[PDB]
């Protein structure tokens, strides 16, 4: 207990992140903690309009992470 999420496999891979609020971003996994809070580099916001905007390196709180999908092969 106080377990890690099993995410080493996904380290330094490009990912597609579905967040709550119908929000979606894409970026490279740079790290994580036991709460599933993530560090995502070269992150891009995929606006509901279809337009995408570069936001750089960011922190996503694991709380609000619905789902992730790898855009690479692990």
């Amino acid at each position: 207990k106080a377990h890690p999420p099993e995410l080493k496999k996904f380290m330094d891979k490009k990912l597609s992140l579905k967040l709550n609020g119908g929000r979606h971003v894409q970026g490279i996994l740079r790290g994580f903690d036991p709460f599933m809070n993530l560090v995502i580099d070269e992150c891009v916001e995929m606006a509901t309009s279809g337009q995408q905007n570069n936001i750089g390196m960011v922190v996503i709180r694991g709380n609000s992470i619905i789902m992730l999908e790898a855009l690479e092969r692990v």
Binding site: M36, I65, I66, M67, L68, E69, A70, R73, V74
Partner: peptide, 11 residues
């Protein structure tokens, strides 16, 4: 269709 996914338990 997706090759690889990971979903948080809470959600």
């Amino acid at each position: 269709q997706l090759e690889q996914v990971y979903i948080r338990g809470s959600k």
